[PDB]
Short mmCIF file of C-alpha atoms and ligand atoms in Angstrom, two decimals:
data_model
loop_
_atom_site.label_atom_id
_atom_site.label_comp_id
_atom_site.label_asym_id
_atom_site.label_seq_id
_atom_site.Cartn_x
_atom_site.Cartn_y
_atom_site.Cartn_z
CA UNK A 1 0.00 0.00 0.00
CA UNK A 2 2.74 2.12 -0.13
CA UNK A 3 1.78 4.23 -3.17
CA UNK A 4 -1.83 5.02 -1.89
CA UNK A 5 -0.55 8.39 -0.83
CA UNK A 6 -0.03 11.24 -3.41
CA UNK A 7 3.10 12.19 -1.77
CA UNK A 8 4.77 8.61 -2.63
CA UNK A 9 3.39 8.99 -5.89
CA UNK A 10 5.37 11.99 -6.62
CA UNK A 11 8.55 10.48 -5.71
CA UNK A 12 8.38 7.87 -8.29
CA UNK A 13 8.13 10.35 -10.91
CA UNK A 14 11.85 11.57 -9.96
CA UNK A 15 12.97 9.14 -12.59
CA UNK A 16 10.01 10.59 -15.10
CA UNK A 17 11.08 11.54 -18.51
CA UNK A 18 11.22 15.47 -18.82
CA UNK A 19 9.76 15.46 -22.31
CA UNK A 20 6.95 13.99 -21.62
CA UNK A 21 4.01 16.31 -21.84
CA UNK A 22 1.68 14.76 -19.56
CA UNK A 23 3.21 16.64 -15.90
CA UNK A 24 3.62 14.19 -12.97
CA UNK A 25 1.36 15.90 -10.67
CA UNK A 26 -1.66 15.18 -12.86
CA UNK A 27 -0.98 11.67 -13.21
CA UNK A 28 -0.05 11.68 -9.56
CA UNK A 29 -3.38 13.42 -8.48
CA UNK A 30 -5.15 10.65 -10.85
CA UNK A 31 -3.95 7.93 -8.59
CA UNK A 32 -0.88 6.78 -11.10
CA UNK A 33 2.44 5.80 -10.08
CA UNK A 34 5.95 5.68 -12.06
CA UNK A 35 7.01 1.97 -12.66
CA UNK A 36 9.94 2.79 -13.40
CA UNK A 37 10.86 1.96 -17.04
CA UNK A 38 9.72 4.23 -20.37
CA UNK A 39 6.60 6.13 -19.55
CA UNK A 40 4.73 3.42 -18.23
CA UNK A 41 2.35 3.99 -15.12
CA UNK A 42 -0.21 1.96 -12.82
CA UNK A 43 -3.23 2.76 -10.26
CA UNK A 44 -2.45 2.21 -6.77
CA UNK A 45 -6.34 1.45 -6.31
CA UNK A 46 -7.22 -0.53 -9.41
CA UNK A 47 -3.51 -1.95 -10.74
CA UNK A 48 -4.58 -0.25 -14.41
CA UNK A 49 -1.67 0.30 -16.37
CA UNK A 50 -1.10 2.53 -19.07
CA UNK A 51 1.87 3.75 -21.40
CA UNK A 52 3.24 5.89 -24.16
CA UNK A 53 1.07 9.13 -22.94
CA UNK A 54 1.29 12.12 -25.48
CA UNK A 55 0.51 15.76 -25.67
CA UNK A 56 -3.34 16.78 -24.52
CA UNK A 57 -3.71 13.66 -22.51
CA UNK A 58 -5.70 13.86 -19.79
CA UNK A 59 -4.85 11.13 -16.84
CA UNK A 60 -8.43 11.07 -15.13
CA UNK A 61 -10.13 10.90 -18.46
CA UNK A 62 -7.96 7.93 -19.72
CA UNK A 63 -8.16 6.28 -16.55
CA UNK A 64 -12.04 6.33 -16.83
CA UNK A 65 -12.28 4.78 -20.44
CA UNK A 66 -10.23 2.02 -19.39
CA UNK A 67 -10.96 1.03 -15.87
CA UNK A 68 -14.34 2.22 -14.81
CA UNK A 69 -14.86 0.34 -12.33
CA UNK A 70 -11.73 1.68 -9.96
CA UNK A 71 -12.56 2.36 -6.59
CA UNK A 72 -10.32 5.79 -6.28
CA UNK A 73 -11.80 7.17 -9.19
CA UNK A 74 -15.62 6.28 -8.47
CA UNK A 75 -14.50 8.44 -4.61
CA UNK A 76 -12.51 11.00 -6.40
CA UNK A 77 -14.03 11.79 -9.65
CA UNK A 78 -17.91 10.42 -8.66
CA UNK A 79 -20.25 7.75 -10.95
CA UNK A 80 -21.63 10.27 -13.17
CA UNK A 81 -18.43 11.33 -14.53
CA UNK A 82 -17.38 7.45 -15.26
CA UNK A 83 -20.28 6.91 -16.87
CA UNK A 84 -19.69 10.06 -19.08
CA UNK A 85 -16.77 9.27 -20.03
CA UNK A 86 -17.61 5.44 -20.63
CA UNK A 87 -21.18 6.69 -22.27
CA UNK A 88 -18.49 9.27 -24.63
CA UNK A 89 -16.31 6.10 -25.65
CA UNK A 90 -18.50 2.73 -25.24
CA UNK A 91 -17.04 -0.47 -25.50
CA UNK A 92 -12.65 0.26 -25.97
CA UNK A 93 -11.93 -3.18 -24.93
CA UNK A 94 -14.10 -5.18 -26.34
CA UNK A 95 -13.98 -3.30 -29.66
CA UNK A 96 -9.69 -4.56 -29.53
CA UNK A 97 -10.78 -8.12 -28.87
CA UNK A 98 -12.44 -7.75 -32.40
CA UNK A 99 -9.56 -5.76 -34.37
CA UNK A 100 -6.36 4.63 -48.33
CA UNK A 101 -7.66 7.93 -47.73
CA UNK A 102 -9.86 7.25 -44.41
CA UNK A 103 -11.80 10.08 -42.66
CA UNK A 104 -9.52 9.65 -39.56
CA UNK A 105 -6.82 11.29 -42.18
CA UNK A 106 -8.91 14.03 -43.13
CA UNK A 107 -9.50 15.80 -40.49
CA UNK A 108 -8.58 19.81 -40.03
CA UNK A 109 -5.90 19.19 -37.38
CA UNK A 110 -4.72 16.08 -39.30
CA UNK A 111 -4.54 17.52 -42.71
CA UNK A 112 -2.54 20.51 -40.73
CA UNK A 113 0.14 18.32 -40.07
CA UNK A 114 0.62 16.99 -43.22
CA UNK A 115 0.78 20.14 -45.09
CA UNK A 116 3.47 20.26 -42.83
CA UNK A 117 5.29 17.88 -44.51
CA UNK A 118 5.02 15.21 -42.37
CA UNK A 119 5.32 11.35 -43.54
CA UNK A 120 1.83 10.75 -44.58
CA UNK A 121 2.30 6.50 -43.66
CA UNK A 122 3.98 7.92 -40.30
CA UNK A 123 0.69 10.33 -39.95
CA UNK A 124 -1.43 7.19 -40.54
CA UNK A 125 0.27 5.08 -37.86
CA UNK A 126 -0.13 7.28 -35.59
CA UNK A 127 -3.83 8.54 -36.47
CA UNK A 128 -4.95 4.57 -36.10
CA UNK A 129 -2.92 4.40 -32.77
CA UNK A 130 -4.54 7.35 -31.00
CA UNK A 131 -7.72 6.55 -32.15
CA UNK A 132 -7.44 2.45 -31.05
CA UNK A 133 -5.82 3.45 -27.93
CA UNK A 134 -7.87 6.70 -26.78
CA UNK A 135 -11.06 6.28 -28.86
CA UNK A 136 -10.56 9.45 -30.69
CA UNK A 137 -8.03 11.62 -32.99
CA UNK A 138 -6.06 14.43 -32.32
CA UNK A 139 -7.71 17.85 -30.98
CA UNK A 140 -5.47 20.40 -31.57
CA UNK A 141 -2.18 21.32 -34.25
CA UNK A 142 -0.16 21.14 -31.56
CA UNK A 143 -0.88 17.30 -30.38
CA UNK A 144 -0.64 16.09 -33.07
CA UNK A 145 2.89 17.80 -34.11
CA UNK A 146 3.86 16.45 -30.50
CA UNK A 147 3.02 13.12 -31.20
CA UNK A 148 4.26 13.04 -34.63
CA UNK A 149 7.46 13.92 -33.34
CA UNK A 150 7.73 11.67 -30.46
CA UNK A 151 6.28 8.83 -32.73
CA UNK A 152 9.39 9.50 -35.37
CA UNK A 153 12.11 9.13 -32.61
CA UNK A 154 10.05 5.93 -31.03
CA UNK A 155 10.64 4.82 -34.73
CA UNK A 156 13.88 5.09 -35.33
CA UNK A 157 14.48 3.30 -31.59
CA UNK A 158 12.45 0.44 -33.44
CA UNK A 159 14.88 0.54 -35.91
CA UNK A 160 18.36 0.25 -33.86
CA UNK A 161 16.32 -2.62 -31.59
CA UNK A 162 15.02 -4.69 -34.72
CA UNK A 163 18.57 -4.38 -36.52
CA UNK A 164 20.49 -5.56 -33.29
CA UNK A 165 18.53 -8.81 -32.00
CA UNK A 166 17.91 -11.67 -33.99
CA UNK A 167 14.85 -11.92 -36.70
CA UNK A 168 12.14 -13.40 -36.99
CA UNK A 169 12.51 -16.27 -39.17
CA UNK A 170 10.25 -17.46 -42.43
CA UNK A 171 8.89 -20.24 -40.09
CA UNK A 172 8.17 -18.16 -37.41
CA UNK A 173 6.46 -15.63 -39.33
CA UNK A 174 4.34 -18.18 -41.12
CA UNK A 175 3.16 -19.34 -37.91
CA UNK A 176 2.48 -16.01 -36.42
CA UNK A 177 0.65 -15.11 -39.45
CA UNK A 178 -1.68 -18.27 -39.15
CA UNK A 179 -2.38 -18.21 -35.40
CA UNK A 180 -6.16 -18.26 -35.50
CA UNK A 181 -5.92 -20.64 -38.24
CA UNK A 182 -3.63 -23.37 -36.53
CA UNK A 183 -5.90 -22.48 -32.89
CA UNK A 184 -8.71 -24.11 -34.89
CA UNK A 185 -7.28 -26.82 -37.13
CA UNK A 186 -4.24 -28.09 -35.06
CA UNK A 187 -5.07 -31.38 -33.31
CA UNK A 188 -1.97 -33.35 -33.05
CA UNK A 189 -0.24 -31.61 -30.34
CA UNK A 190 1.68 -34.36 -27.93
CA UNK A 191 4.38 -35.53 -30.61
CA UNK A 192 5.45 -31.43 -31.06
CA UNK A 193 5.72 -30.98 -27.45
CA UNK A 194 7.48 -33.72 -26.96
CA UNK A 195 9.66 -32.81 -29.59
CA UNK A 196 10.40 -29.18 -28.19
CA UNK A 197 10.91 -31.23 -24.66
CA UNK A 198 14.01 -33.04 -26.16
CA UNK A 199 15.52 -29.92 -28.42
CA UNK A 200 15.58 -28.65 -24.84
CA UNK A 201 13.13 -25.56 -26.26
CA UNK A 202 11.32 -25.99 -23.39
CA UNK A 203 11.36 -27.33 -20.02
CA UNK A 204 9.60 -30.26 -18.18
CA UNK A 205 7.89 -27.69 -16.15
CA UNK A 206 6.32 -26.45 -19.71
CA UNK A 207 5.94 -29.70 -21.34
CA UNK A 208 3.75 -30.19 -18.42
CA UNK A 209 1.51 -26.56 -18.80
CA UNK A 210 0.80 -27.55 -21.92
CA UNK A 211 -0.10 -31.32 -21.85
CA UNK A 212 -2.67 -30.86 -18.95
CA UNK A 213 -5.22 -29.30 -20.76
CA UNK A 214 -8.28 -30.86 -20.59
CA UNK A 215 -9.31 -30.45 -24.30
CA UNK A 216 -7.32 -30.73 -27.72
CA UNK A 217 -7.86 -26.93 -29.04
CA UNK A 218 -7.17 -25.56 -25.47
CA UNK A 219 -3.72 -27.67 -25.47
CA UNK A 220 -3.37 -26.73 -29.14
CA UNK A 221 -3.57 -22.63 -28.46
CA UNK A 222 -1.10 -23.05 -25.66
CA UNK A 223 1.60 -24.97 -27.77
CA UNK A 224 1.16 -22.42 -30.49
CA UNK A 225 1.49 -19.01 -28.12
CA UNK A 226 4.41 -21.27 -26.37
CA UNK A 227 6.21 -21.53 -29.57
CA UNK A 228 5.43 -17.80 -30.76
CA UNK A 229 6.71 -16.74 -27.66
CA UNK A 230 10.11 -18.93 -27.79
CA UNK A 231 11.05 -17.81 -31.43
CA UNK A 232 13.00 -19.11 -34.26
CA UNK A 233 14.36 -22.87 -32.78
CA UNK A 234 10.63 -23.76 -31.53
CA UNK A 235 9.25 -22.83 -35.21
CA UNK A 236 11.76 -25.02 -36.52
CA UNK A 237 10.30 -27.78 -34.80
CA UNK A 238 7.60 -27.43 -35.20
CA UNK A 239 8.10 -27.09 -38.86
CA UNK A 240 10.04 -30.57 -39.14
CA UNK A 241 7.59 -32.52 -36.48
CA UNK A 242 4.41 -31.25 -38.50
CA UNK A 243 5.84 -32.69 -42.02
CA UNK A 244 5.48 -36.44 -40.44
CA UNK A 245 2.55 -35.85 -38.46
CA UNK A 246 0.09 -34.48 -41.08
CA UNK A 247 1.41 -33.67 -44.48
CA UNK A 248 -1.67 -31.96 -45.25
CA UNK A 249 -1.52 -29.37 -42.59
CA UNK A 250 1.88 -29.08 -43.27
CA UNK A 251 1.99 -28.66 -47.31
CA UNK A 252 -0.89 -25.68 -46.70
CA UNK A 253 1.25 -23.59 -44.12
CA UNK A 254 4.60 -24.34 -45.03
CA UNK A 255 4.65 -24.94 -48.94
CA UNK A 256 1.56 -23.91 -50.61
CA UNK A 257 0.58 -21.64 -48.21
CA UNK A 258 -3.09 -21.10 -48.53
CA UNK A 259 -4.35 -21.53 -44.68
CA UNK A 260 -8.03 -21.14 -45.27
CA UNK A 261 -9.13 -19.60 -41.64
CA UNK A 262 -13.01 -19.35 -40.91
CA UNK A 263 -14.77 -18.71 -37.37
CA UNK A 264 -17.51 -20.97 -36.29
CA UNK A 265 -19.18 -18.43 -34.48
CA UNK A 266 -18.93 -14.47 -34.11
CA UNK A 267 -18.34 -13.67 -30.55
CA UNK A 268 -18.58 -10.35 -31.23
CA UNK A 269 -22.02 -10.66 -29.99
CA UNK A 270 -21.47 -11.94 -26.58
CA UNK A 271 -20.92 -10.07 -23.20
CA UNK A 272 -17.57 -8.72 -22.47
CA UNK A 273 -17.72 -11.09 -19.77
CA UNK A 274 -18.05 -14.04 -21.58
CA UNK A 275 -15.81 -12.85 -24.66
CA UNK A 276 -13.18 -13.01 -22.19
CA UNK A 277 -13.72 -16.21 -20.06
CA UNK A 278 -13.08 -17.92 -23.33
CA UNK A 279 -10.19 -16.01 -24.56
CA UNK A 280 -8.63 -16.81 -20.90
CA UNK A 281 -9.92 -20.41 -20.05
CA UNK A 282 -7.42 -22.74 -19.32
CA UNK A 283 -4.86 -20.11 -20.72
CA UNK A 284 -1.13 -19.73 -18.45
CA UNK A 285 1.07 -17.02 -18.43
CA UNK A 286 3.79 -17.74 -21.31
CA UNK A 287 6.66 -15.61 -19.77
CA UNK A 288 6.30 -17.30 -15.86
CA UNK A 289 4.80 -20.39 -17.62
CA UNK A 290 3.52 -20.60 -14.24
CA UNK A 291 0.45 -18.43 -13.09
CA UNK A 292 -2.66 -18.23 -15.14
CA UNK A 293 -3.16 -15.40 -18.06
CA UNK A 294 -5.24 -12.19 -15.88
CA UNK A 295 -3.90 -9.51 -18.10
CA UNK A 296 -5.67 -8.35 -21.73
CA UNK A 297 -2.16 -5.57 -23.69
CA UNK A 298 -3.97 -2.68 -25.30
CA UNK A 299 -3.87 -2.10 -28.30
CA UNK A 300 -3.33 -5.19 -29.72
CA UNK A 301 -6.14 -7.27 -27.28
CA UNK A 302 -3.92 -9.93 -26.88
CA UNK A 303 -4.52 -12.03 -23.59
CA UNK A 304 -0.47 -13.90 -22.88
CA UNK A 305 0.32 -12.84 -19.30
CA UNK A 306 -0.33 -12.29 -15.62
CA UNK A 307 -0.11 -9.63 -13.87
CA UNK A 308 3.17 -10.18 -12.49
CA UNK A 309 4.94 -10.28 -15.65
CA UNK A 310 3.26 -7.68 -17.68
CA UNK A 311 5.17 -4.71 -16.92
CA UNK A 312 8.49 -6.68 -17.46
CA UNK A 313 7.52 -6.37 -21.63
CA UNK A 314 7.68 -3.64 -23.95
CA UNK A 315 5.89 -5.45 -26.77
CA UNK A 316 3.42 -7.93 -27.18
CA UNK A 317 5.70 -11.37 -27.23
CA UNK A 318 2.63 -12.76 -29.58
CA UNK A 319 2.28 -9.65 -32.33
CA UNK A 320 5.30 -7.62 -31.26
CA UNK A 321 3.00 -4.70 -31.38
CA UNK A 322 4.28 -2.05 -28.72
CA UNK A 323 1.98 -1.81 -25.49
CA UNK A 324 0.28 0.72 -24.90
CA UNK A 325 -1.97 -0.83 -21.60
CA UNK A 326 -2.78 -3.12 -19.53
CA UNK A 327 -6.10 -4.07 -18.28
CA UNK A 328 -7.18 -7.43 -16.00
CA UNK A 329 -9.51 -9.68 -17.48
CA UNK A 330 -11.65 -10.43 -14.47
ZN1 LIG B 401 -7.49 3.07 -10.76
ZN1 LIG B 402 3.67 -14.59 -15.45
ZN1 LIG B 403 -0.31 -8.74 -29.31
#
């Protein structure tokens, strides 16, 4: 409980970067705390997380459209102006569990900017960003400038990280690329975990995550994740164990590759509630491989960690899309 006063709060922001617009008394005073790495900040009340903050961003605002239901909001903001805000900008989440010359780029403020001269496929990433991740576009010439700037440097960071770790492979992008596709058709998944058991890939402790699933496509979505999540040598075995398993499967990812994917049901229509007790049921944390999934990453809506081992990632270890939030799924 040791951030629940503002005066704690503060402190953490000692290590706050400067150029950040967004002042540490207003997040402070909104009942967020400094983590300690990037930008990235959490609730003392309600453990809501949220990153990458730009220029007219308003802490008690945000923290309404994402987590509602705090208990230091509700007391210091009231229910009438948390169900404005959620009333303003229904239904963030669930709308990311669904995921050119677009209105969002024609807009006064944004067509400002790019008689500017700025990149118009820059402008555009960071148009469908603020809009995904706030619910609406820029208000003013000066946001958006601000973000376009910050977004430029975050981009050529991107570049220097991407060039100096190892890439992705064909293999592993293949599989990535496919993920809702092999969730659904995938049913042989006991000789592949072995397999990744005795490359050493993974770990007895894992093997065992994965095998005690109580139905095939629960098992198969956790082998897959597993293997997105461990990179280049677990797509390589899988690769090579799929080949002798089922040639069919294998000749439409790997060689001809013309997955056909097709849902057997829009869930698009059920309760938040019940969108996500599927999306987490039987589902373990792939970076502890050892408490359950409790944590949905905004933007991207992807459900891979606890709570624990969230703020430990700058990027989505399933989509490598940055993180921009994090919000519990119960
Ligand atoms: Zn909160
Ligand atoms: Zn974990
Ligand atoms: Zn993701």
């Amino acid at each position: 409980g040791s951030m629940q006063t503002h005066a704690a709060r503060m402190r953490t922001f000692m290590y706050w970067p400067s150029s950040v617009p967004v002042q540490p008394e207003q997040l402070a005073s909104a009942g967020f705390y400094y983590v300690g790495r990037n930008d990235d900040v959490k609730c003392f009340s309600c453990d809501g997380g949220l990153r990458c903050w730009e220029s007219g961003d308003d802490p008690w605002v945000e923290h309404a459209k994402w987590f509602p239901r705090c208990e230091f909001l509700i007391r210091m903001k009231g229910q009438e102006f948390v169900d404005e805000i959620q009333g303003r900008y229904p239904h963030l989440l669930e709308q990311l569990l669904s995921t050119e010359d677009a209105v969002m780029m024609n807009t006064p403020v944004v067509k400002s900017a790019l008689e500017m001269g700025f990149n118009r496929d820059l402008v555009k990433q960071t148009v469908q960003s603020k809009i995904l991740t706030t619910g609406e576009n820029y208000k003013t010439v000066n946001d958006i400038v601000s973000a376009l700037l910050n977004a430029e440097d975050e981009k050529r960071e991107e570049e220097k990280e991407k060039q100096a770790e190892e890439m992705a492979s064909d293999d592993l992008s293949l599989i990535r690329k496919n993920r809702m596709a092999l969730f659904q058709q995938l049913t042989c998944v006991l000789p592949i975990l072995d397999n990744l058991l005795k490359a050493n890939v993974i770990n007895k402790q894992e093997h065992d995550i994965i095998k005690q699933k109580t139905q095939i496509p629960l098992q198969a979505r956790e082998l897959i994740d597993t293997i997105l999540v461990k990179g280049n040598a677990a797509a390589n075995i899988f690769k090579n164990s799929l080949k002798e398993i089922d040639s069919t499967l294998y000749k439409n990812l790997f060689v001809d590759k013309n997955m056909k994917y097709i849902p057997t049901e829009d869930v698009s229509g059920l309760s938040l509630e019940e969108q996500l007790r599927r999306l987490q049921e039987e589902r373990t944390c792939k970076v502890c491989m050892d408490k359950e999934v409790s944590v949905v990453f905004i933007p991207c809506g992807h459900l891979v960690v606890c709570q624990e081992c969230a703020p430990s990632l700058r990027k989505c270890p399933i989509c490598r899309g940055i993180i921009k939030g994090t919000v519990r799924t119960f």
